[PDB]
Design a protein around this ligand. Structure first.
Ligand SMILES: [Mg+2]
Ligand SMILES: [Mg+2]
Ligand SMILES: [Mg+2]
Ligand SMILES: [Mg+2]
Ligand SMILES: [Mg+2]
Ligand SMILES: [Mg+2]
Ligand SMILES: [Mg+2]
Ligand SMILES: [Mg+2]
Ligand SMILES: [Mg+2]
Ligand SMILES: [Mg+2]
Ligand SMILES: [Mg+2]
Ligand SMILES: [Mg+2]
Ligand SMILES: [Mg+2]
Ligand SMILES: [Mg+2]
Ligand SMILES: [Mg+2]
Ligand SMILES: [Mg+2]
Ligand SMILES: [Mg+2]
Ligand SMILES: [Mg+2]
Ligand SMILES: [Mg+2]
Ligand SMILES: [Mg+2]
Ligand SMILES: [Mg+2]
Ligand SMILES: [Mg+2]
Ligand SMILES: [Mg+2]
Ligand SMILES: [Mg+2]
Ligand SMILES: [Mg+2]
Ligand SMILES: [Mg+2]
Ligand SMILES: [Mg+2]
Ligand SMILES: [Mg+2]
Ligand SMILES: [Mg+2]
Ligand SMILES: [Mg+2]
Ligand SMILES: [Mg+2]
Ligand SMILES: [Mg+2]
Ligand SMILES: [Mg+2]
Ligand SMILES: [Mg+2]
Ligand SMILES: [Mg+2]
Ligand SMILES: [Mg+2]
Ligand SMILES: [Mg+2]
Ligand SMILES: [Mg+2]
Ligand SMILES: [Mg+2]
Ligand SMILES: [Mg+2]
Ligand SMILES: [Mg+2]
Ligand SMILES: [Mg+2]
Ligand SMILES: [Mg+2]
Ligand SMILES: [Mg+2]
Ligand SMILES: [Mg+2]
Ligand SMILES: [Mg+2]
Ligand SMILES: [Mg+2]
Ligand SMILES: [Mg+2]
Ligand SMILES: [Mg+2]
Ligand SMILES: [Mg+2]
Ligand SMILES: [Mg+2]
Ligand SMILES: [Mg+2]
Ligand SMILES: [Mg+2]
Ligand SMILES: [Mg+2]
Ligand SMILES: [Mg+2]
Ligand SMILES: [Mg+2]
Ligand SMILES: [Mg+2]
Ligand SMILES: [Mg+2]
Ligand SMILES: [Mg+2]
Ligand SMILES: [Mg+2]
Ligand SMILES: [Mg+2]
Ligand SMILES: [Mg+2]
Ligand SMILES: [Mg+2]
Ligand SMILES: [Mg+2]
Ligand SMILES: [Mg+2]
Ligand SMILES: [Mg+2]
Ligand SMILES: [Mg+2]
Ligand SMILES: [Mg+2]
Ligand SMILES: [Mg+2]
Ligand SMILES: [Mg+2]
Ligand SMILES: [Mg+2]
Ligand SMILES: [Mg+2]
Ligand SMILES: [Mg+2]
Ligand SMILES: [Mg+2]
Ligand SMILES: [Mg+2]
Ligand SMILES: [Mg+2]
Ligand SMILES: [Mg+2]
Ligand SMILES: [Mg+2]
Ligand SMILES: [Mg+2]
Ligand SMILES: [Mg+2]
Lengths: 50, 48, 100, 154, 115, 110, 137
RNA sequence: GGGAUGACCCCAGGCGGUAGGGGAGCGUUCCCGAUGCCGAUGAAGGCCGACCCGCGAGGGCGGCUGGAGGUAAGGGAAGUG
RNA sequence: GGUGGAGCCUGGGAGUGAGGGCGCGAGCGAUAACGUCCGCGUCCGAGCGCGGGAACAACCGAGACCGCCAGCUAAGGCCCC
RNA sequence: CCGUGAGGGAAAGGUGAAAAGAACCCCGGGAGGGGAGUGAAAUAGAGCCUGAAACCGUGGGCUUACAAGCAGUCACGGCCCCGCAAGGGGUUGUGGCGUGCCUAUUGAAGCAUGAGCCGGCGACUCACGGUCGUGGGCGAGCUUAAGCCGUUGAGGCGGAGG
């Protein structure tokens, strides 16, 4: 082995969800939050488990 | 009140406005006595 | 003399020596291709039926192409939907040798 | 925006000036305003399971041993450290400086003799780590060291 | 590490403006009016690729129909005659025949009127 | 062979002076000389200087023969604008731009 | 294989009597001729197509009550500036014009359709300029 | 299915799409790779291009400019479009 | 019978909780409303992509993976535009 | 600089290895330029590295004064250019087609929001818990925390605890 070939297994990095970069790219604009009120708002909702 | 332009006028529509803005050169006669050039019906700048 | 032949779901008017581009057909470059037994003579009478049966056109497969890229774009206003796709269409280039 | 220099003052009355609408100029929407979600000091450490470092150490040696690139030596004699003296013992050792070498010995004199070679990295045995095994083409230990590397695994 | 815009956004805009070369006024000069014009020009191109196929056929027909009205019949009967005669040759594209090869065209009229 | 003078940072509005430069272009230096004298705009003063500096540049530098000079090319580009505050009613304060011309006369032989 | 398109053709000329031909039925034909849609090299963007001369206008006949009942309208830019001219008065005043307006309305709109109209020359009764060619109906 | 246990060939199907879910990728800054490699016979950046590769985001290549930097394969992390 | 982008079970992520036109069944209205309220269906919503209806979200036709200067049709059309 | 005052509060870096920072001459009142000279380079000339875009200008090709429009697109033709050529680049005469982008809405070209244009800044993060998944380690077990030793980009130890 050497540092060139080290690398991780095919699971194990994933490497995550952007949100709010371009259209198409999926998430974009509304950033998966979808159209107005409280849940889209910054502090969002009231703690739904109660 | 207070009229205002509704759209920035285009580079073309303004330059078209200026289609009349060109100067015409001064109209000049050669001086009967002196060598030089004069507007007619005026007194020569050299040798009145 | 001329011939009206059919290749790739399309009909073209071939004289001998004419180079022409055609929906891509399966054969090596330089192989010889016998074009389906076609539709018309340039000496007239021979027309007939779907196809005059047994008279042929032979053409040399000159090589295989890919056409100049066409950009296929799709845009839907106020829905935030755009797609951009390049497409270039495979072809085969032929030389018309003789009309049999 | 809370940590930037500027005032807390509202810049404009908020209605009727014909302009957009603002707070303090510390707001991240202003040039010179605060950053949003940018870096703060953080500690990147985590605790890798000891068994996993133990194994990966063993495995990393093994990978070198299975290449035949491990060599254990006794005593040097390229000691009393002078990189000239080490360079001799290294010649007889067949290490020509054509492959990076990781040299593990507790002998401070041999260590400093090799320290300055571009192709040598050196360690006390108690600091054997896998990152240095993998960086180096050849692994070289003495008979101490290798003894404690052994007692360290298991 | 901070990754600022740097070179990227300029290149993106330059790309579009190259595509907009030749458009009127700001539509070639301004990244936005360029981008807007392109959206159009891209859906028009797709629409008119679809409809170039229609546009050409309509011309062939007017020309076919014109030439066999010279020989005294319709387009509509003529096509039936050829459907009858098995002559599904014509592929209206060959009104090339109708113009350059008149006597070939005439023999096709005849084969058509026998039905 | 050509000769050129450029007056730079001439404090005048390009549109205004460009208009007289338009008067003398492709003209023989002798009529250009007359036109500027009897053209009434502050722009003739300036172009005249550049003209002359370029005609002078022709004879003493590029070996160009004064009698054969005409204006082969010429133009005014627009230098940096001096900006000043103009106080208005109800506390207002606009900015007038006092603008700047870079005048170029380029001479050639007929 | 590209579709054929003419190089410059030479204009043919035609002459029609129009006496007793009806109106829209004559106009239909004059239209197709003007366009050149009989010529089977016809092309939409060109203006290849016959010039047309018509004599014995004023002698067009029409069916129904249209001589009294059919009105042509003309709007000036001005208030109340809509003029209503009944067919009979037109024929009695500017016969032709009745064919001209019938063919104009039947040619395509545009710069080219406006040129084709220039190639229709309509006269009342007989004669005309004689130095072109002109076959018949 | 082919028995290459395939990374490909053949056959048959599906492939409008906002909210939204899922999946693959492009690029940007930084790190290891790096005491290395590219570089004045010209780095980055800029301006062109009708050429090549890529579905695309992009990557090349040539010319001009520029005059001191740049940074592979493979992986890591983010003030990343 | 039906192998279907069917069904059922467990669990991760949602978004939605302003609907609208049309048809048919009612109520309210005046056997008014481009009215209003329910029911069953549909389409627009998201198919303001395509053909027809002069033009026109939802009426008729038809579910647009890409390319073709090939063919057959739908609705609607075939005097000229 | 703004505010009576508490107080608010900016912009603004880069010639060149080296000033060798352009003597002298010419136009000019100066400014500026033109030669000369320096320099590897002077569109490195001090309003100085690179020098993008909006914006303005000179010159050249095609084009346009009986046509009408979200400015394009598809076709054919003219002229100009590159080429060996069926080739391609430019431009646009005529013909077909064609209701800007974003936002918000049941529904917008909409006579509903937003935007003069260009460049640069600009918004899903981090910590600690949780709960799922996934990659690995060990598995009736798993695992250390604070510390301590070592190292100076070396790791180990530590079993309280959970
Ligand atoms: Mg997604
Ligand atoms: Mg979505
Ligand atoms: Mg969500
Ligand atoms: Mg919103
Ligand atoms: Mg919500
Ligand atoms: Mg808040
Ligand atoms: Mg809140
Ligand atoms: Mg639209
Ligand atoms: Mg959109
Ligand atoms: Mg504060
Ligand atoms: Mg503060
Ligand atoms: Mg402060
Ligand atoms: Mg306060
Ligand atoms: Mg306002
Ligand atoms: Mg500030
Ligand atoms: Mg700051
Ligand atoms: Mg090394
Ligand atoms: Mg090394
Ligand atoms: Mg940095
Ligand atoms: Mg940014
Ligand atoms: Mg079709
Ligand atoms: Mg048929
Ligand atoms: Mg005042
Ligand atoms: Mg005051
Ligand atoms: Mg202003
Ligand atoms: Mg398929
Ligand atoms: Mg889809
Ligand atoms: Mg679907
Ligand atoms: Mg080298
Ligand atoms: Mg050199
Ligand atoms: Mg960089
Ligand atoms: Mg470069
Ligand atoms: Mg690098
Ligand atoms: Mg950010
Ligand atoms: Mg389902
Ligand atoms: Mg679920
Ligand atoms: Mg509710
Ligand atoms: Mg809502
Ligand atoms: Mg409700
Ligand atoms: Mg409802
Ligand atoms: Mg009914
Ligand atoms: Mg209703
Ligand atoms: Mg009702
Ligand atoms: Mg009702
Ligand atoms: Mg419904
Ligand atoms: Mg909606
Ligand atoms: Mg909608
Ligand atoms: Mg649907
Ligand atoms: Mg509409
Ligand atoms: Mg319609
Ligand atoms: Mg419709
Ligand atoms: Mg529809
Ligand atoms: Mg489909
Ligand atoms: Mg003060
Ligand atoms: Mg310096
Ligand atoms: Mg020199
Ligand atoms: Mg330069
Ligand atoms: Mg320089
Ligand atoms: Mg500057
Ligand atoms: Mg430098
Ligand atoms: Mg500079
Ligand atoms: Mg510029
Ligand atoms: Mg010009
Ligand atoms: Mg007229
Ligand atoms: Mg004209
Ligand atoms: Mg057009
Ligand atoms: Mg908006
Ligand atoms: Mg709203
Ligand atoms: Mg509303
Ligand atoms: Mg509403
Ligand atoms: Mg409007
Ligand atoms: Mg609006
Ligand atoms: Mg309003
Ligand atoms: Mg509103
Ligand atoms: Mg911007
Ligand atoms: Mg998150
Ligand atoms: Mg967590
Ligand atoms: Mg978690
Ligand atoms: Mg496990
Ligand atoms: Mg210590």
């Amino acid at each position: 082995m050497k540092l060139s070939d080290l690398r991780p297994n095919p699971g194990a990095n994933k490497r995550r969800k952007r949100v709010g970069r371009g259209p198409g790219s999926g998430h974009g604009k509304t950033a998966t939050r979808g159209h107005k009120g409280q849940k889209s708002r910054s502090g969002g909702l009231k703690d739904p488990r109660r | 009140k207070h009229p205002v332009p509704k759209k920035k006028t285009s580079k073309a529509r303004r330059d078209a406005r200026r289609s009349h803005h060109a100067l015409t050169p001064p109209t000049l006669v050669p001086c009967p006595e002196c060598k030089a050039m004069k507007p007619p019906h005026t007194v020569c700048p050299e040798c009145g | 003399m001329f011939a009206i032949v059919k290749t790739g779901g399309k009909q073209y008017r071939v004289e001998p020596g004419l180079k022409l581009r055609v929906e891509k057909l399966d054969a090596e470059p330089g192989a010889t291709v016998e074009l389906p037994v076609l539709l018309l003579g340039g000496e007239k009478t021979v027309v007939g039926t779907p196809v005059v049966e047994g008279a042929s056109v032979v053409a040399e497969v000159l090589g295989h192409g890919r056409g100049k890229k066409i950009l296929v774009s799709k845009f839907k206003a106020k829905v935030q939907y755009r797609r951009k796709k390049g497409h270039r269409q495979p072809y085969t280039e032929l030389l018309i040798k003789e009309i049999r | 925006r809370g940590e930037v220099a500027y005032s807390g003052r509202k810049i404009w009355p908020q209605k009727h000036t014909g302009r957009a609408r603002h707070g303090d100029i510390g707001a991240p929407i202003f040039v010179g305003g605060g950053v949003v979600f940018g870096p703060k000091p953080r500690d990147y450490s985590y605790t890798l399971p000891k068994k996993v470092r133990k194994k990966g150490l063993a495995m990393a040696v093994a990978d070198r041993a299975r290449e035949g690139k491990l060599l254990l030596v006794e005593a040097f004699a390229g000691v009393n450290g002078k990189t000239k003296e080490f360079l001799a013992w290294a010649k007889e050792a067949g290490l020509d400086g054509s492959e990076s070498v990781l040299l593990v010995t507790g002998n401070e004199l041999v260590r400093r003799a090799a320290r300055n070679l571009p192709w040598v990295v050196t360690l006390a045995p108690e600091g054997l780590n896998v990152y240095d095994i993998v960086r180096t083409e050849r692994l070289v230990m003495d008979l101490d060291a290798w003894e404690v590397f052994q007692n360290r695994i298991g | 590490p901070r990754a600022k815009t740097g070179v990227v956004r300029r290149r993106k805009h330059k790309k579009i403006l190259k595509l907009a070369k030749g458009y009127w006024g700001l539509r070639s000069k301004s990244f936005r009016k360029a981008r807007e014009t392109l959206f159009a020009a891209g859906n028009y191109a797709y629409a008119h690729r679809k409809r170039r196929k229609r546009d050409f056929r309509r011309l062939w027909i007017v020309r076919i129909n014109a030439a066999c009205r010279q020989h005294g019949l319709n387009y509509s009967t003529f096509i039936h005659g050829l459907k009858k005669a098995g002559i599904e040759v014509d592929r209206k594209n060959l009104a090339d025949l109708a113009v350059r090869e008149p006597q070939v065209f005439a023999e096709l009229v005849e084969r058509a009127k026998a039905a | 062979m050509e000769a050129k003078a450029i007056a730079r940072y001439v404090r005048i509005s390009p549109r205004k002076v460009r208009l007289v430069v338009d008067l003398i272009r492709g003209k023989s230096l002798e009529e250009a000389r007359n036109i500027l004298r009897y053209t009434n705009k502050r722009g003739a003063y300036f172009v005249a200087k550049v003209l002359e500096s370029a005609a002078a540049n022709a004879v003493n530098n590029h070996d160009m023969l004064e009698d054969r000079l005409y204006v082969k090319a010429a133009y005014v580009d627009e230098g940096p604008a001096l900006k000043r505050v103009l106080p208005r009613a109800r506390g207002r304060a606009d900015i007038i731009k006092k603008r700047t011309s870079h005048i170029t006369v380029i001479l050639g032989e007929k | 294989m590209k579709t054929y398109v003419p190089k410059q053709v030479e204009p043919r000329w035609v002459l029609i009597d129009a006496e007793g031909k009806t109106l829209g039925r004559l106009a239909t034909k004059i239209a197709t001729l003007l366009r050149g849609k009989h010529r089977p090299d016809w092309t939409p963007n060109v203006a290849m197509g016959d010039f047309v001369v018509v004599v014995n206008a004023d002698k067009i006949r029409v069916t129904g009550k249209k001589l009294e009942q059919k009105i042509y309208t003309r709007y000036s830019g001005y208030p109340g500036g809509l003029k209503k001219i009944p067919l009979e008065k037109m024929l009695a005043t500017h016969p032709e014009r009745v064919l001209e307006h019938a063919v104009k309305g039947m040619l395509p709109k545009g710069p080219l359709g406006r040129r084709l109209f220039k190639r229709l020359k309509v006269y009342a009764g007989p004669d005309h300029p004689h130095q072109a060619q002109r076959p018949e109906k």
